[PDB]
Amino acid sequence: DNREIVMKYISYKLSQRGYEWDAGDESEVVHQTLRQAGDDFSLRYRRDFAQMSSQLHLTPGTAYASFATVVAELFRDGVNWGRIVAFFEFGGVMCVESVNRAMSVLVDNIAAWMATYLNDHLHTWIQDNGGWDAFVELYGNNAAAESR
Ligand SMILES: CCCCN(CCCC)C(=O)c1cc(C)n(-c2ccccc2C(=O)N2Cc3ccccc3C[C@H]2CN)n1
């Protein structure tokens, strides 16, 4: 389910910062692989997230517009797994930031916007491209390459 993968992902990100989410908490290997891929994405692009956040100026009034803007740029050159990982980690980072700015009402909204975008705009692609199992396979190949 699209709701479930978003929910597990967001739950994990918030739990990483000690935040337990009222509405929170696909194979287990899929969730685990997406968790690691997102964590590596954040490690590499930490500085970029910090700069982008500053540009977006998160508020309840502008959160949806910022979410839509980011996602439109992310997928401007089409969908691939790497960009889907970016998507998840962007939604995660935005949920952590919401909580940090005493805007925790946004977490539920961001999770809904993520699940909707998955449903309306990534679902076809995912299925055409072998589903979440293909993501796991890709991750494996890349891990073996990065090892050697
Ligand atoms: C995490 C989603 C960032 C999407 N974005 C910012 C939109 C601001 C309105 C992008 O410009 C964007 C577009 C693409 C294809 N991507 C990437 C996808 C995979 C790997 C890197 C990028 C990328 O282009 N960047 C990574 C990143 C991460 C966090 C914050 C901003 C950016 C932008 C660039 C930085 N070099 N990021």
Candidates 93, 13, 84, 8; CA nearest to 58 is 93
Q: Whose CA is nearest to atom 9 of ligand 1?
A: 70
Q: How many CB atoms lie within 10 A of CB 44?
A: 9
Q: Whose CA is nearest to atom 13 of ligand 1?
A: 74
Question: Which of 40, 46, 52, 87 to probe ligand 1 with, by most ligand atoms within 8 A of CB?
Answer: 52
Q: How many CB atoms lie within 10 A of CB 39?
A: 15
Candidates 68, 62, 6, 64; CA nearest to 31 is 6
How far does Cα 114 stand from its chain's mean position?
8
Burial of 93 (0-12, 13-18, 19+ CB in 10 A): buried
Can you tell me the distance from the alpha carbon of 48 to that of 130, in angstroms, rounded to the nearest whole number? 31
Resolution (angstroms) stands at 1.8
* CB 3 near ligand 1, within 6 Å: no
**Tokens representing 125?**
């692609």
- Beta-carbon contacts of 109 under 8 Å, excluding residues fewer than 6 positions away, are 63, 64
Q: Which long-range contacts (CB under 8 A, 24 or more apart) does 57-66 make?
A: 58/94, 58/97, 58/98, 58/101, 58/103, 58/106, 59/103, 60/103, 60/105, 60/106, 63/94, 63/98, 63/103, 63/106, 63/109, 63/110, 64/109, 64/113, 66/94
The technique by which this structure was obtained is X-ray
Answer yes or no: are the C-beta atoms of 9 and 38 closer than 8 Å.
yes
**Tokens representing 112?**
């809904």
Question: Which of 13, 66, 74 to probe ligand 1 with, by most ligand atoms within 8 A of CB?
Answer: 74
Can you tell me the distance from the alpha carbon of 99 to that of 128, in angstroms, rounded to the nearest whole number? 36
**Cα–Cα–Cα angle for 134, 136, 140, nearest 5°?**
115
Burial of 50 (0-12, 13-18, 19+ CB in 10 A): exposed
Eight-class DSSP state of 140: H
Candidates 80, 107, 119, 76; CA nearest to 12 is 107
Can you tell me the distance from the alpha carbon of 88 to that of 37, in angstroms, rounded to the nearest whole number? 10
**Tokens representing 51?**
């700069």
Distance 6 CA to ligand 1 centre (A): 20
Q: Whose CA is nearest to atom 35 of ligand 1?
A: 48
Q: Whose CA is nearest to atom 24 of ligand 1?
A: 74
* CB 135 near ligand 1, within 6 Å: no
